[PDB]
Symmetry: C3
Subunit: 440 residues, 3 copies
């Protein structure tokens, strides 16, 4: 579609606060729902928790130095709500705010643009005790927190993201109960999805009120659905899975409505107050898109809440997570999102892969991660060359970290972390990404 | 006209000697006309002068470090003629030459290409005492100075600019008297304009004689003119203002003549000697080129030409009162390329001034960011239409002495606290840094 | 064919081991055929040898720093076979391997990708004593050495080159005797050419057995031929020169045969055994192309081994070597190679020029070298814009060095070396190349 003079492209890396910071009970930080969830036997593999993680709260200068060495222009990170406002609403924690000031200022000194995500799943436990995302007030608590962060940091930080992956917070956290807070109820999942999206919209309006030059987006993960079957019911299964994973969150933001076919199949009411859909669909400067894999499904009349099930397709390449590797789906997803939702521009805020890494002679050679990265960058640029306005790519992740219910066993870093010593070791994929940033 | 393999683009920042150096009476430097002019009550806002400025004469390593941090590939700077030859013609001041050697070598060690401008308005007072640019000999004194600078520095410096903005030196300095040397006489302004341009041409030839690989250009500022009226006389007002500001200097360089409509309206003769117009129009490797457009209307009573400036209502303006209109930048670039067809164009200055505030040791300047974003976009719009724009130099790296406005008008992407000389990068510096890396 | 999003380009510099390392009798290194050849009166101008060279064995950190300062992404270097296996086949010299480990790891710390060449003319004398490249076993000795290097270093080094410029090793080393080992016999040159090419193929197969992600190529120099005459015999001279210099080595690699017109004109048998041509023609990930100049020739019935002679065409620009400067030939060569041999991609592994340099006030201003570089980069990008898959460019050389039989008098560096002090002084051409790397 013709690269032209003046066009820009941003290369970054991505992390999140609970997954890397540690210092969970230091620096005035209050507990999050993941501190609580991680204390429940069976919730997280190996009984892992984020108490220490990568100790980035103390080691951030080293990690910023690794970012400068990589040559990224941008760093996508999240602010830990319970580190800066431990009670959820009310008093700012000065020690927590000072940490993010030092992080931001350190990034800027090194030429790196920080990209803050306000909510990456670490809801303060003080707010969960009041109902969390099931409580409509949580959307307003989130918007007030967002306003305070923009008041503190938007003199420097101009590109904001409100929430990350509401699919995970709503459905995995409140319907399937495999993420914090561990609730298993469809109606609660529906309420949570609405208040996450309403929070997004209210926070967007609050940030824009701080200053009109600020840019705001949302990060959505999309899981394209296919079926191996040919029956009419298996084609319906694809539509249902696409509606559950993708359109449930994208349609409110970009079309100001929930997908009617899924609303009907649930048979429950979304707690929409007058004015809510206008707030949720407030115009955005960009979409942050997360992509890792496609899902294969088939019809299943017995399944709940919707009559389809996951299938493990045979004879396909898979990562250490068991996730199918299929880069062509990334190209097609990007084209589809641009056509159906027409975001002004798209940033890939997460893409990456996990494999079993081995340290040999103090080094980590990870050719399968390199291969996934190469093929997904190629697929992203194929979409850009067709005219999709992809303005940057952020690798998940800079460093190995706490992979939620999988714990530390699943390593997404381009830089290895030895958790016994906290040593950082760049992998082969780090050298590859460094080259791609420079030579593209 | 899209990018092809091998195409290059240069990102830079720009300063000038009197505006940043300081050390005005140190290191053997002799006075310039701006040292004198800055001493006249009422000439400069707040009684400011360049005695200290940004103290860059002593702090140049810090400023070079800031350039490397920004990631610029080039640094446009000027050589202070009265620092290197205090008497204007005659002996070199070795201490002054050594300063520019240290500056140049420090830039090259950091990977930065210095782009020297030989004349950015600081004529030695020693030469003003002999008539300055009113004196035809000043063109030759300038060419000899230029030759000596190329002999000293062109082993390293391959891209030269002779003079900067003769509009200001000639008309603002000798007709309106609002810039040094402060003279107010049309014939003097005409003489100065011709001898500035002749000096440009003589210096170009002198530099090329030093080495055939050297490249040379001139820097012209252009101020596109519009009118809000529809009468034929308001259209004439646009022509007169365009001729006075732009064609008076562009036509000699690229067409070997002065614009006849302005010559006729002046009613005076340009002091053209045999050979002059061949010299002035000598081929250039590039044009150094913008801040704003002017709005005008006819005024039969105005002098020297029958037009006056108009302050249009409800337009966006900088802290200087200058209209912000980036589309005019695109159209100017297209016009210059068609009208004068320079081999290539470098934007040697573009930028904006706004009231900056230090808050918590930082400077957030969104209006300057917005001006910069929109003018880079407008520049690339012209490049994508085929205009051969090969680079862009932001005015300025640091806040500095803005001539008759003094220090109150801040053009830097890096703030200077004049009490302490601390440099504080503004939001616009981080924006520019990103643009340099990610384009 | 214009730039599209995602396309990459690699900027590098090139050196070779014997030409820069020095430490010839230190660190356990055994002698090479160039140590021997350089001791023969008359073999090398001024009696020069590589005993000390640029002392890069000790000064590599400074040279790597200069690469980082230039901004190159890649460093093409060669491994000295007699430094790492002094006996040619048998035991590794751990001290020699540790040097290449330090070099590689230092390059990677600086963000530079090392591109190893396994054979750049410094055959162990221990193997020359057994016949060198005249002996078929040398192809297998080379493959065993190559396997050992890939086993040691391919955890980090993913892009390999087997041999460099077999034209020089075979014909200049064994027919004209002007390069080591100094033999002057057509049959020996034919045997050597075949065993170099077989060694390439065997080494390629051995490297790929180490790991399937590794990439392998060969470096060939091509010297395009023209004539000033119009006679049919002068047109035949062009064909003969092209066959001798270029097709003799390119045709086996890409067409699995030797050029029949040259075989017939030699009147000798190439010692081809079963399996050899399949091995020599094994698919490659890229061609490393070296180009410096074109040759002008005319028919000469008295000349041997083929009836043509070199002509010094009148009134053309020439370097300090006496080599014609004609950048348009570089564009046309790249187009011809892409059509005739169709390599998957091409890296310019060497291009550059030598001129008499003068140090003035501690600096070196070399406008003729700048001009050659500018014009040849322009010519290369002209071919890329026509669709030739040129993926990178490596300047010969980072530093002035031992120019084989010309000794140290011929300087190819963009960085000057004062051999009395070993001081490195960047030339004007270094600043030009630094600018081109950044601003393209």
């Amino acid at each position: 579609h013709m690269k032209k003079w003046g066009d820009m492209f941003t290369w970054g890396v991505s992390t999140s606060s609970y997954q890397i910071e540690g210092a969970a009970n230091q620096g005035g930080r209050g507990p999050s729902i993941w501190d609580t969830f991680s204390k429940i036997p069976g919730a997280v593999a190996n009984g892992d928790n984020g108490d220490v993680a990568c100790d980035h709260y103390h080691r951030y200068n080293e990690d910023l130095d690794l970012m400068k060495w990589l040559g990224v222009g941008a760093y996508r990170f999240s602010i830990a709500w319970p580190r800066v406002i431990p009670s959820g609403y009310g008093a700012l924690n000065k020690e927590g705010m000072d940490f993010y000031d030092r992080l931001i200022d350190g990034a800027l000194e090194r030429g790196i643009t920080p990209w803050p995500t306000l909510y990456h799943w670490d809801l303060p436990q003080s707010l969960q005790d009041k109902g969390g995302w099931n409580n409509r007030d949580c959307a307003y608590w989130f918007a007030e927190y967002s306003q305070k962060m923009a008041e503190a940091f938007s003199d420097r930080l101009k590109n904001w993201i409100t929430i990350n992956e509401p699919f995970c917070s709503a459905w995995l956290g409140h319907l399937y109960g495999v993420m914090a807070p561990g609730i298993k109820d469809l109606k609660t999942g529906i309420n949570a999805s609405h208040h996450l999206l309403l929070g997004h919209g209210l926070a967007t309006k609050a940030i824009r009120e701080v200053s009109s030059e600020l840019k705001v987006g949302i990060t959505l993960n999309f899981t394209p659905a296919i079926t191996l079957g040919e029956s009419s019911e298996d084609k319906l299964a694809v539509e249902l899975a696409d509606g559950f994973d993708n359109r449930w969150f994208g349609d409110p933001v970009f079309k100001a409505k929930y997908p009617e076919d899924i609303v009907k199949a649930f048979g429950k009411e979304v707690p929409i107050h007058p004015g809510d859909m206008e707030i949720i669909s407030t115009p955005l400067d960009y979409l942050g898109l997360n992509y890792y894999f496609r899902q294969t499904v088939e019809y299943d009349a017995t399944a709940k809440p919707l009559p389809y099930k996951q299938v493990t397709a045979p004879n396909v390449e898979r990562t250490g997570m068991g996730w199918e590797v299929h880069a062509q789906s990334f190209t097609e997803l990007l084209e589809r999102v641009s056509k159906e939702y027409k975001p002004k521009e798209i940033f890939i805020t997460e893409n990456g892969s996990a494999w079993d890494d081995e340290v040999v002679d103090g080094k980590v050679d990870d050719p399968n991660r390199v291969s996934y990265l190469e093929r997904h960058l190629d697929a992203m640029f194929a979409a850009k060359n067709k005219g999709v306005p992809i303005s940057g790519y952020f690798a998940w992740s800079l460093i190995d970290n706490f992979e939620w219910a999988y714990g530390y066993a699943k390593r997404f870093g381009i830089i290895y972390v030895d958790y016994q010593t906290q040593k950082r070791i760049p992998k082969s994929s780090a050298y590859y990404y460094q080259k791609r940033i420079k030579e593209s």
